[PDB]
Design a protein around this ligand. Structure first.
Ligand SMILES: OC[C@H]1O[C@@H](O[C@H]2[C@H](O)[C@@H](O)[C@H](O[C@H]3[C@H](O)[C@@H](O)[C@H](O)O[C@@H]3CO)O[C@@H]2CO)[C@H](O)[C@@H](O)[C@@H]1O
Ligand SMILES: OC[C@H]1O[C@@H](O[C@H]2[C@H](O)[C@@H](O)[C@H](O[C@H]3[C@H](O)[C@@H](O)[C@H](O)O[C@@H]3CO)O[C@@H]2CO)[C@H](O)[C@@H](O)[C@@H]1O
Length: 210
């Protein structure tokens, strides 16, 4: 199918981080304010007052080679819902921008009220907090515009160390692509992605392996 992308990092607990969202073995892991994995899936999101659960820093993209990367995204898929997309993995083939022709496999770990139809909001530290700002409470805040985040690669140099790799990826593998278009199909989640979130759908084994 065809989709549109944006970029984000708001530090909030991901929506597929709650139990009862989808038919999975366990929800996506959340972390404490110091980027360390916690196991209380009922823990209050850090984007809410008195919350303690934030997005883990390892739920960020990385390059496997110059034409292939792995990562995560907040999704809104037409005709579906959180029960259908939480923890599902999708292979995106970019169709526009400087990354046209490259592919990336992402695991869907959340969604947003502002997402349109077939809209993938890629997890990218420095890509913009958007509606909620959980990074201020978590560690003091991230630089950049509310929507769109930072604009230069050297601005990644002052990020908390755990968020640096994801920040640099944006300018390195991704070439600072500005909301590139893509084609997508559902795939079985690579073991590398489930190792970071802990979350695998019961129906994962029905889709093609990458
Ligand atoms: O039902 C479980 C718990 O839900 C809590 O609300 C969360 C929503 O379930 C979840 O959809 C939403 O997700 C946010 C996400 O954190 C944010 O990063 C993204 O930009 O937007 C999403 C959609 O708004 O988070 C909320 C808040 O944590 C209830 O608060 C809780 O009582 C309930 O048990
Ligand atoms: O709301 C969804 C997510 O949006 C992310 O910001 C995007 C803006 O929503 C999107 O409108 C903006 O698009 C720009 C584009 O980058 C710019 O070059 C063009 O000239 O103008 C467009 C319209 O303003 O792009 C950003 C970045 O993807 C938020 O960063 C994210 O938190 C939020 O969930």
């Amino acid at each position: 199918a065809d989709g549109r992308s944006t970029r984000y990092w708001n530090c909030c607990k991901p929506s597929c981080g709650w139990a009862k969202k989808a038919p999975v073995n366990q929800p996506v892991f959340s972390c404490n304010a110091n980027f360390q994995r916690i196991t209380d899936f009922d823990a209050k999101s850090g984007c809410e007052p008195g919350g303690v659960a934030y997005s883990c820093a390892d739920q960020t993209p990385w390059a496997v080679n110059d034409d292939f990367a792995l990562g995560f995204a907040a999704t809104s898929i037409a005709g579906s819902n959180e029960a259908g997309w939480c923890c599902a993995c999708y292979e995106l083939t970019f169709t526009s921008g400087p990354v046209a022709g490259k592919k990336m496999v992402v695991q869907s770990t959340s969604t947003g009220g502002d997402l349109g139809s077939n809209h993938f909001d890629l997890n990218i530290p420095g890509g913009g907090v958007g509606i909620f700002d959980g990074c201020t409470p978590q560690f003091g805040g991230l630089p950049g515009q509310r929507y769109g985040g930072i604009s230069s690669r050297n601005e990644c140099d002052r990020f908390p160390d755990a968020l640096k790799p994801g920040c640099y990826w944006r300018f390195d593998w991704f070439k600072n692509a500005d909301n590139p278009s893509f084609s997508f199909r559902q795939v079985q989640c690579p073991a590398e992605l489930v190792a970071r979130t802990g979350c695998r759908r019961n129906d994962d084994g029905n889709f093609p392996a990458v």
